[PDB]
Design a binder for this molecule. Structure first.
Ligand SMILES: CC(=O)N1CCC[C@@H](C(N)=O)C1
Ligand SMILES: CC(=O)N1CCC[C@@H](C(N)=O)C1
Ligand SMILES: [Cl-]
Ligand SMILES: [Mg+2]
Ligand SMILES: [Mg+2]
Ligand SMILES: [Mg+2]
Ligand SMILES: [Mg+2]
Lengths: 194, 194
């Protein structure tokens, strides 16, 4: 019933652009929506986000997260490891690559979501959510080597999966951080399950 | 270590703007970032709310109430938690219960309310509160719920069992062209992983 008629470029940067989208509403009435898009998409989605399950025997299972300064937020955020998919890269490969660069961990793919939207009222940004296990007892993950790209400055924070939401709330209460909505949602459902 | 040096408007629409953010990196080097922000945020603790609406009924499995809407940024239909922007002076809880009633017809009860969480912190400053709400589907108020859509709102309600949420979303995605929201997928994934 609803569909895009046209788009009008308002402003284009190097990495983001702002458009005015004209669309048909289900009554037959024409309407406008201010939308953001990345300039970098060519493949399945803009980015991957990695749910990294760190498994060590005789230890609680942890979810590995990253803390970074985020210029659009003006502050530090706690997030799933993540990045944009390179031209000609698969989402699985992007996930394992980003996880290694941001955490130094080498993991195995468990599952891969379809393209899911980040903020569909605002942008067309999509990611693949990629669940990865990390065998923390394997020699390669003994002393994990984070390989930042130029301009990345990433702290690794591993939290127990069993208490994830309480631990995130605690970091927020002490550290003045912002938790990512996908991280929080996952933490919530861990608590809400069964 | 890192902080914002300056924020330069690049282009301001009615609803969304693009800014050039100058910031200090942790090596002591000045860098820039293209950032998206809404123009609508006043004194609210966040831009918006998303509602995790748990529909409870005697002799029923618990459902998660979702909505399906055309999203002009995406050029297509998206399946999301019920959500909207917080009105000036409105609390996150009031916003959540109001949006839930507008979008689904259901009259909920507050369970919990997250801190402000970031939507896509590498792109925008946008934040939500994620508000968990239970819906007593045995109350006569919630018997034959009618959405009260606002001007230009066109919302379908989809309630799926919590105990099968990821597979049921996968089956909706296999049947038509639509995108599941990343927070919904994240929460469906945790329900599997727990
Ligand atoms: C409620 C909302 O998100 N609004 C109103 C309609 C236009 C939208 C836009 N231009 O992006 C903003
Ligand atoms: C790695 C990446 O996606 N970057 C490059 C640095 C500038 C950033 C921006 N302009 O939003 C985007
Ligand atoms: Cl797993
Ligand atoms: Mg990253
Ligand atoms: Mg990276
Ligand atoms: Mg809405
Ligand atoms: Mg609404």
């Amino acid at each position: 019933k609803q569909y895009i008629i046209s788009e009008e470029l308002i402003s284009e940067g190097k990495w983001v652009k702002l458009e005015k989208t004209t669309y048909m509403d289900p009554t037959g009435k024409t309407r406008t929506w201010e939308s953001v898009k990345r300039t970098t998409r060519k493949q399945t989605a803009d980015g991957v986000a990695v749910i990294p399950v760190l498994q060590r025997t005789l230890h609680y299972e942890c979810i590995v997260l990253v803390k970074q300064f985020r210029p659009p937020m003006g502050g530090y955020c706690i997030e799933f490891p993540a990045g944009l998919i390179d031209d000609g890269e698969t989402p699985e490969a992007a996930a394992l690559r980003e996880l290694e660069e941001e955490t130094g961990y080498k993991g195995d793919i468990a599952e891969c979501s379809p393209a899911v939207c980040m903020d569909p009222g605002l942008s067309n940004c999509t990611i693949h959510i990629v669940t990865v296990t990390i065998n923390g007892d394997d020699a390669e993950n003994a002393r994990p080597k984070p390989k930042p790209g130029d301009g990345e400055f990433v702290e690794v924070i591993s939290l127990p999966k069993n208490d994830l939401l309480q631990r995130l709330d605690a970091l927020v209460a002490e550290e003045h951080l912002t938790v990512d909505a996908r991280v929080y949602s996952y933490a919530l459902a861990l608590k809400h399950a069964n």
